[PDB]
Scaffold this active site. Structure first.
Site: not given
Ligand SMILES: [Cl-]
Length: 223
Positions: A66-67, A64, A77, A88, A187
């Site tokens: 980035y918050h 989802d 990303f 990441s 990941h």
């Protein structure tokens, strides 16, 4: 409505009238009136504005958005300048530094340069409530992004899918292995990157696959 690439809008038109999509739109609208939702409404489909659907060469799946404030902008990303690359992305850059000759850390985390070359940076879930990871999962987005992957699988040929993490591996199960190329790895998150992502060399392998299909490779350095 205007912030949605024309070729994509046409090919994905069927989704807009389906019950799950209507409910998803209703949900997100409700969330935006009650909370802060990322990315901004006008950037939710940025991935449809960087290139035509027929020109997609590589696909990278994210979870989802980035918050955090000013981070997400519609590409998985990627983070808006001058926001620093999240953990990441730091590892993605790390792999690129050893995998691609001449690759140099751009100093920022904006991946628009890749998207313009045909690299679809698709999050499985397209919105998120501020500071709450996965707050918008299981609301309909997964079905919509499955539709995107399915369209590519059925209508295109020779597309390279880079699936990082178990979640992406599962989502990529729908991909027709007979028509496309699928590369998998753990990941890039620091929590798992050292168990296989670092050293996966997916970027050079991806370009190798493109050349094979008589297609121009991606200049991963152009950021
Ligand atoms: Cl909002």
């Amino acid at each position: 409505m205007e912030f949605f690439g024309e070729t994509w809008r046409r090919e994905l038109a069927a989704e807009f009238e389906k019950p799950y999509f209507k409910q998803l739109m209703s949900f997100v609208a409700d969330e935006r009136s009650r909370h802060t939702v990322y990315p901004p409404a006008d950037q939710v489909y940025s991935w449809t504005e960087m290139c035509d659907i027929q020109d997609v060469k590589v696909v990278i799946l994210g979870q989802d958005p980035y918050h955090g404030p000013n981070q997400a902008h519609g590409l998985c990303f990627s983070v808006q300048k001058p926001v620093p690359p999240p953990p990441s992305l730091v590892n993605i850059y790390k792999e690129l530094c050893t995998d691609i000759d001449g690759f140099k850390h751009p100093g920022h985390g904006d991946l628009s340069g890749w998207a313009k070359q045909g690299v679809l940076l698709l999050n499985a879930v397209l919105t998120v409530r501020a500071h709450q990871a996965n707050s918008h999962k299981d609301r309909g987005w997964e079905t919509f992004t499955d539709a995107v992957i399915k369209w590519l699988s059925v209508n295109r040929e020779g597309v390279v899918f880079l699936l990082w993490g178990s979640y992406a591996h599962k989502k990529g199960a729908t991909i027709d292995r007979k028509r496309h190329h699928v590369l998998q790895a753990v990941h890039p998150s620091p929590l798992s990157a050292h168990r296989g992502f670092l050293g996966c060399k997916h970027f050079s392998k991806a370009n190798g696959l493109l050349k094979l299909s008589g297609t121009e490779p991606i200049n991963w350095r152009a950021l």
